[PDB]
Amino acid sequence: GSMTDLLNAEDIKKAVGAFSATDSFDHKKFFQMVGLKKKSADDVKKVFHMLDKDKSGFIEEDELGFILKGFSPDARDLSAKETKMLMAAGDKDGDGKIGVDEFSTLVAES
């Protein structure tokens, strides 16, 4: 039920702390620092489902700003700007949302 069950805590601590500044967020650097590239595709799918709050099968623009909080509750929200850029990068169909396969690509291209 937790990210510490899928990832190392000190990896989460250093990755989140790296983006403590605002508008600083880069998803690729983050994903490498947390160790999601070290993980299996199914463990990455486990991450996506935790980030899906409503459990629609997609991460919408409202759920995307709480990405850091999915790894660390204490973490900050992403700005509208940071969220809107991560949505541009992750949305590949123009649906305006991110599905599991799109999320898998994000992590895989990091």
**Annotation: binding site for Ca(2+):** 52, 54, 56, 58, 60, 63, 91, 93, 95, 97, 102
User: Segment contacting Ca ion (CB under 5 A): 10-18, 27-35, 60-68, 77-85?
Assistant: 60-68
Please answer whether residues 68 and 9 qualify as being in contact, where contact means their C-beta atoms are separated by less than 8 angstroms. Answer: no
Residues in the chain: 110
Burial 69-106 (b: 16+ CB within 10 A, else e): bbbbeebbebeeebbebbbeebbeeeeebbbbebbeeb
CB of 51 to Ca ion, least distance (A): 8
Residue 82 is a binding residue for Ca ion (CB under 5 A):
no
Q: Which is nearer to Ca ion, 1 or 10 (CB)?
A: 1
Q: Work out which of 19, 52, 70, 107 binds Ca ion, going by CB under 5 A.
A: 52
Minimum CB separation from Ca ion for residue 88, in Å?
Answer: 11
> Which of 38, 56, 73, 108 touches Ca ion (CB under 5 A)?
56
Asked if residue 106 lies in contact with residue 90, where contact means CB atoms within 8 angstroms, the answer is: yes
